[PDB]
Structures are given as structure tokens and as C-alpha cells.
Amino acid sequence: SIRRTGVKTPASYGKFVLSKENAVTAIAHHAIMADFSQHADRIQQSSQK
Amino acid sequence: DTLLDKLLNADAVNTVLRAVKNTADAMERGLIDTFLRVLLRHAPPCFVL
To answer: Which residues contact A33 (CB under 8 A, 6 or more apart)?
Structure first.
């Protein structure tokens, strides 16, 4: 049942980025909400999409 | 730099430059101060003069 097979694997690391917004957020009240502009477009759209 | 270092570094730069800039201000105003105080210590009053 054990079959030797080449499995695709990531050859690099993921990244966590701090936005222009998000640095001012972490300065302002010492927290980050991840994916902020992807929240804010939902804000100016209908909210919970 | 994932950009949160960059504000901190440029604020270190701004703090050092504003320190030297207000330092030159303090040097000029202290020159004003001690020049005025030397004129006070070398100026007799009008009822003497």
C-alpha cells in the first residue's frame, strides 16, 4: 500500500505583510486585523461578503 | 523592513534632526540670552547716568 511518489511541495515560504494602513493600525491601537483592504472594499460594498 | 521598521527608522532620523535643529535654535537663543545679560551687567540705570 505504500507507493513511493514525488509529491509537490512548496519550495518557498509564505509571507505575512503589513499594509500601509496596517502599520498605522498597529501604531494607533496596537493590533492588526489581517486582510484589511479586503475588509474595506466590503465596507464600501455590502458588508458581509 | 516589512514597512513597520521604516517609520521607526525615519522617526529616529526625524528625532535626531529635530534635536540638532532645536539645538541650533537653543544655541542662538542662548547667545541672545547671555548677550542681553552682559548688557544688563554692563548697563547702569538712568538715574545714575
So the answer is: A22, A25, A39
Using DSSP, state whether B19 is helix, strand or coil. Answer: helix
Q: Is B4 within 8 Å of A23 when comparing Cβ atoms?
A: yes
- In angstroms, the CA B31 to CA A2 distance is 87
Closest chain B CA to residue A18: B2
Method of determination? cryo-EM
Cα–Cα distance between A18 and A24 in angstroms, integer? 10
Helices (H) and strands (E) counted in chain A, each on its own, are 2, 0
List the one residue out of A48, A6, A18, A45 whose CA is nearest residue B1: A18
